[PDB]
Amino acid sequence: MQLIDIGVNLTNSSFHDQQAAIVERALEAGVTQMLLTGTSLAVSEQALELCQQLDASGAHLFATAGVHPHDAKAWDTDSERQLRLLLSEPRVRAVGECGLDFNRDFSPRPLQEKALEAQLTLAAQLRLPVFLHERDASERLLAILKDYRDHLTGAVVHCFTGEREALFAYLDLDLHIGITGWICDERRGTHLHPLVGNIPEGRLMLESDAPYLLPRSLRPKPKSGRNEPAFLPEVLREVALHRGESAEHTAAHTTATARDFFQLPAENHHHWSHPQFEK
Ligand SMILES: [Zn+2]
Numbered sequence: 613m614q615l616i617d618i619g620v621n622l623t624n625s626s627f628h629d630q631q632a633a634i635v636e637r638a639l640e641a642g643v644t645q646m647l648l649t650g651t652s653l654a655v656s657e658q659a660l661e662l663c664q665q666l667d668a669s670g671a672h673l674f675a676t677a678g679v680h681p682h683d684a685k686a687w688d689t690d691s692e693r694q695l696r697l698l699l700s701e702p703r704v705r706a707v708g709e710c711g712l713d714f715n716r717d718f719s720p721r722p723l724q725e726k727a728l729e730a731q732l733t734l735a736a737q738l739r740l741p742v743f744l745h746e747r748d749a750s751e752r753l754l755a756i757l758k759d760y761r762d763h764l765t766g767a768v769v770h771c772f773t774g775e776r777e778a779l780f781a782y783l784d785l786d787l788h789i790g791i792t793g794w795i796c797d798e799r800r801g802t803h804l805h806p807l808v809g810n811i812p813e814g815r816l817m818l819e820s821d822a823p824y825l826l827p828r829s830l831r832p833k834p835k836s837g838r839n840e841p842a843f844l845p846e847v848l849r850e851v852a853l854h855r856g857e858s859a860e861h862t863a864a865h866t867t868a869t870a871r872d873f874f875q876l877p878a879e880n881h882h883h884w885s886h887p888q889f890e891k
Pocket residue numbers: 709744745746770771
């Protein structure tokens with residue numbers, strides 16, 4: 613039962629340089645490949661450097677490069693050029709995380725749109741798929757994508773949390789959908805239960821978004837409250853259940869989808885990497 617975690621924020625400070633153990637626990641749990649998410653030029657560089665530092669063969673760790681809407685305001689005159697270079701690294705497999713977040717509004721909206729469009733333009737010219745974030749902005753995101761979609765090899769709406777109409781609109785644009793532990797959240801994720809089954813096989817992928825979105829049904833829960841990619845099987849369990857399919861079958865098809873979407877290569881216990889009650 614191999615799984616692929618399409619979005620790990622493995623450079624996060626909150627991991628306090630314990631990425632090696634985190635990766636070891638993931639592999640041991642059968643999460644055999646992971647996409648390390650870039651959220652700014654600096655964090656995209658660090659994500660790539662982590663792939664290089666931890667995984668010399670290029671079998672397990674890959675990166676995305678992009679600028680997140682929270683950080684769109686840092687998009688500047690040298691951004692396009694630096695990102696184009698980073699994207700041409702072979703371990704870098706997608707453009708993103710990029711998109712729109714009108715809930716937080718941590719960058720002005722026009723600056724968000726500007727950064728998004730420049731990244732979609734790069735994705736189109738470089739023939740790389742897009743890793744999208746959207747929150748309270750489905751209407752703007754759909755309008756923007758309309759002019760790009762025909763020119764993209766593909767795009768995923770990562771960590772989809774919205775309602776039926778938004779889902780079907782994304783599906784109608786032929787977008788992939790990524791599902792996280794938000795689905796295990798009894799307070800805000802139950803509305804996904806009737807929806808996950810509408811995502812065709814071949815368009816559904818899974819992701820932890822670690823350290824965020826620790827599945828609320830997990831046990832034992834880490835005292836830190838940090839999510840990690842080894843907890844992805846709890847997401848698989850819940851997604852399989854509401855799709856009415858075996859865990860083995862959901863695992864198989866999401867993994868095949870992710871391999872294709874990111875162009876990943878085919879397949880082929882330690883005590884130090886399982887500290888108990890870690891800070
Ligand atoms: Zn996101």
